[PDB]
Amino acid sequence: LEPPTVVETLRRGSKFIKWDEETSSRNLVTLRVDPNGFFLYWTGPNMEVDTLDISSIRDTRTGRYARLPKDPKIREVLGFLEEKLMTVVSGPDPVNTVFLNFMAVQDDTAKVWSEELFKLAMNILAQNASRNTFLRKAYTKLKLQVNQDGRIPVKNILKMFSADKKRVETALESCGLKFNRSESIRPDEFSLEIFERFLNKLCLRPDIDKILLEIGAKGKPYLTLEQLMDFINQKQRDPRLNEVLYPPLRPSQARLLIEKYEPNQQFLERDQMSMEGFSRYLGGEENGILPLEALDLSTDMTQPLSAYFINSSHNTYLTAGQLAGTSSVEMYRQALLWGCRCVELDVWKGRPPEEEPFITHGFTMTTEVPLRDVLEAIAETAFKTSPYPVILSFENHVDSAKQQAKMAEYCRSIFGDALLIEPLDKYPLAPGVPLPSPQDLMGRILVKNKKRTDEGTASSEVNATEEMSTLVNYIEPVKFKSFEAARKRNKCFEMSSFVETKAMEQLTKSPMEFVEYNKQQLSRIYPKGTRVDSSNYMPQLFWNVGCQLVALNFQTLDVAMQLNAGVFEYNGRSGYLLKPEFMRRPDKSFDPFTEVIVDGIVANALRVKVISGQFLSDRKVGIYVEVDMFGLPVDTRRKYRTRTSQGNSFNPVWDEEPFDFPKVVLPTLASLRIAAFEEGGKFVGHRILPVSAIRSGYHYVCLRNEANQPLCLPALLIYTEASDYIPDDHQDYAEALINPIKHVSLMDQRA
């Protein structure tokens, strides 16, 4: 994690011939990035600037990977080198992305611009930024987007806070600016101390005016050093942590918060923080809902491959329904650059005039993609965002002897070095020795294929030859027999892939044994062939028994894919999560369908109270907030949901009881989901937090859309109380352990 710095060739910009294919309009623009790393802006064809949001860039490819022009009028006007092209592909979902074809004019300022802009699109301190940063993004979007005369149009400010255009047309008249629906503000006269004041006359806040009556700021305007330091040590302080690992704040330490957040100099001169210095602090860089050591690549990455929730996909190539959609190669690049580590490939037998294998769902008339471009998509983009091993779940339907050699030479020449041909010398393919780690395979691409009708076409694939099976070393599928005849075989490299409605008869019949299978071997689970509209099963139903390769259709982002793209955002967007300790120790055994707390697993007790919201909707509607928790089946039985919005627009305030999830049995598996809607069912935003890392006290949740990219303006304000669990038989005999001296001083006094 680093702050997103902007290189000095990026700021002050370069000169790009920005072309297109639809309109086929070629233009010479100059590209700048603003000095915080927020927007990529360039002047238009009619002298108004445009702003690509950098935080919504999927990829920035260049060189021989970039989008070549097709129109012979535009191949001639660009000068056709091919090492200058730069394609900045952005978009909100992987299914409907929007390209942006540039072309450099100097010698190789495109390999620089396409790398120092991809490091700002994949920055874990920009996507997880504070709330006072997402209000300097909605301010840079107003300073940048000027009209022809070099001045912010007032028809743009009303088009930002577009719920009440009478509270926006009156806040502008109180700060002194022009407030006509056609007029224009000069950008020197819209400084950040004016936009901060303009947001204060807009949004009346009685949520943050109580947070100050509760901590004892009853009278005078200053909140002292002592009250603030008792606030950050007692309310905002996670009560599951050591008091020696993370020590509480000392007065030497809660005084660089005053010198960072205080605007006044007669208050900061002593040690007294004003109220505006407090409301600057609640959305500060410190007071975030998740700590910075929960998002960087910090898990133990050396345990065997059988002990990791690997991310997955099922029929990755389709962009639509499973029956008559359109299959494209781009859903290999957009899946893997999201944190996917198990793609599917349905390699089918090619035609007589050119024997070349292609990819389609079998016998359903979907369009076809060839294998040589699919493998060049997988090889290009695999280790761009996470250096951890990609598994290619082949489905060999090719019954031609002359084409298995073609698909072997394709795998051996396109991947080349990064294909795990030969087994590692440390972990041989012997009965008993386990699978490697993600660190013994950092940068290896492992094929998955056989060696020597709820499923659809997956149930009948051909027997492999000696030319394709020789790349299958560790991950190898084999026909399932039972569990007892797979635990006396004791081979920790073989696997067997389940369909969903036949793993639902092994998840319920024997879930004691189906964890202990997955402590040693792998398992892949793909949705059944009745879901012909590209819908998903819930993966946390199948992650309770520790199944790793849970395959999900990356097309339709329903609730299952808002989960599978929100819990694999942790571990540094690496696509590898670590199983909890009781599902990867071969001695400890436990039931996933349990109803009590497990002996050795510390429980927790969550209490989320949703207080208010900021700028949630773009129209005057009512807004409700759903709060769910996913986990073991004894944690998911609570799905709370607030009443609809009762406060004014730009700031709904809910008066709801705190939602108590009192007994989380395994809190290193459970994950909380806060999804704010509109009345009628429209999505607005959601955030998926884990329970084992979410802090306590009055925090800002900065909401995200359905693919977990940050929404700029919307946010909630919740109050969480994540403490430990103490059972009902002795909740006072865990008070005799915290303060034992006074407990015995009471016991001898009561004699």
């Binding site: 009156t170 806040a171 109180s174 002194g176 004041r197 204060n200 006359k201 009346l204 009685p206 005016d209 009556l213 009853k218 009278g219 005078k220 305007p221 006044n264 007669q266 208050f267 004003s274 505006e276």
Partner: protein, 331 residues
Amino acid sequence: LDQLRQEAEQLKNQIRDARKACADATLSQITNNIDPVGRIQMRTRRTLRGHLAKIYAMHWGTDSRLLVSASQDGKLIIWDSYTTNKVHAIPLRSSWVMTCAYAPSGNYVACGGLDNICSIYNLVRVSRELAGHTGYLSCCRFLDDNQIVTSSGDTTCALWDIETGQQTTTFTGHTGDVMSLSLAPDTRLFVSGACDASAKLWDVREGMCRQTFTGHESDINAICFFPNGNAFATGSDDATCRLFDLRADQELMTYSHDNIICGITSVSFSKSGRLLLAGYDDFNCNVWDALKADRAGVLAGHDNRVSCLGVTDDGMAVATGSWDSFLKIWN
């Protein structure tokens, strides 16, 4: 240092003996034969809406007609209690505004805030610019068109000059920040209440204190006078009021009620001297009897905090300007 503490502190033991020597009667021993007021209800009239953020003070006029309503967004609006019309809507370069006033001649209006300046206006533009404090300003009142007494957060009450723009007298003697003051109806003296749980009686023609009062356990959040000028009452922060008597120099009564935890924000008497209103940070505006220590009615329409209060000169209206920008007027 401690060689003079033997004399300076035995006077603090003498000053309790002198005040306990005269306290032979209380209000419950004289006003037991005083008939009660019953219940006093009031109905909301003419909610002067129009502010964009929190109202922080108000002050009436002498002819019971106009009232300044300072806001937290830089807007001194001079409302009319009859017609609900913004007679002026004077903007400010200052955002944080914590005080306002209105001259007895009606042609001047003051201001203040965290920016240390008491900007007296003219009646539209800034007439004089009053700098000279070193902390945040809290309450400013007018003696006349040529003198203003301000009370800052740098432990200073200050009697100024309007035309030139310099302090003609500075009163120190407090320890903590001075939260409010209130002039006397004779205007030969005034009083002031501060963050060190003290309230001192000054003198405007001399320049120094002459009586100091204690009894509260936290800040004095605001303060006001009995209408004749021979007793004065305060708010507090531990949800209690008082009534000190300047002819006896000792506290007389305390307006504490059970199930009242949220503290005072402003206190203002009536024109008959009989109802002590009080603001509260539990969103209400409760009314006490001044002579029997018992409540007499709730004035509850607001939902955010109540920041200020005041009857007019004739005692007709009660303008309770809350924190939710709606300045209700009761009768």
